[PDB]
């Protein structure tokens, strides 16, 4: 069952993301795949990966909708695509 992604740390240049997989299944499956990008433009994924439950995506573009998705490393399913906006 895919992780659930939500935001608590928006900024002008910073978008800080958080996910919360349920504890029963917390088999701590390696790392978490945070697959972010811009919108329909500059394609540099700049994807970051971490085993924790939250990431602080830095050096982001102001007043831009970045597209984000979190995937369980799968060493099996990824989360739904999410759209967040900088400040």
């Amino acid at each position, epitope marked *: 069952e895919p992780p659930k992604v939500r935001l608590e740390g928006r900024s002008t240049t910073s978008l800080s993301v958080s996910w919360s997989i349920p504890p029963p299944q917390q088999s701590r499956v390696w790392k978490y*795949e945070v*697959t972010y*990008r811009k919108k*329909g*433009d*500059s*394609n*540099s*994924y*700049n*994807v970051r*990966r971490t085993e924790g439950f939250s990431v602080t995506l830095d050096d982001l*573009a102001p007043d831009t909708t970045y597209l984000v*998705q979190v*995937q369980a*490393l*799968t*060493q099996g399913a*990824g989360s739904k695509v999410h759209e967040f906006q900088t400040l």
Partner: antibody
Amino acid sequence: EVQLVESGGGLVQPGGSLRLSCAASGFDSGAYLRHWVRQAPGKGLEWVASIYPSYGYTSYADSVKGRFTISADTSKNTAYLQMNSLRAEDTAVYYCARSAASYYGYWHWYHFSPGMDYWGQGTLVTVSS
Amino acid sequence: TQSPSSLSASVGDRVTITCRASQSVSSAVAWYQQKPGKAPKLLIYSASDLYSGVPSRFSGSRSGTDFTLTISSLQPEDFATYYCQQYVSGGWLITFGQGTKVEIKR
């Protein structure tokens, strides 16, 4: 820092075999895809193939399709380009290059892949009689 | 495929390099600076795109079935050859541009 030291090369004859090998220090392999591209002397670049070391997803080019075989080993932190059925055109300096990550990235949104951030150095590969 | 293959300008002259695309969908645009006799080097990914302390220098956008890399204030180092690279959404293949070269107008 991070490098993509390649190896192999030398000389082999047409209808020959030369297995190319590209080591990789510094960067955590498996995620950063390994790419083979040829720079034929005098002319420009020609992409050979690409593969995702951890998951091992094969991607070849029509120019070399079937002739070669790409592979890698996460433990060895190294990639492999098997060159078989060499033909005259195959003469080139072969280049090793690293790409991005994200299983989602490679799948679904592939056309939005970042460029070859880290390259290799080149080793002469001459196929002549 | 690039519409220019060999060009010439002078120091400081704003230049425009082009490269034909496959269209499909708005896709990736990575250019490389292959200094003659060295190895291809990526400029950088910085939104406006550059190779320095977040400058403009090598800046690009998209124009039709082609893409551009117009640099404003040409400096000596930049003189090299440049290739446009994309990622097709077919068999995860990688196309390449023909290759453009820059010469010092003397």
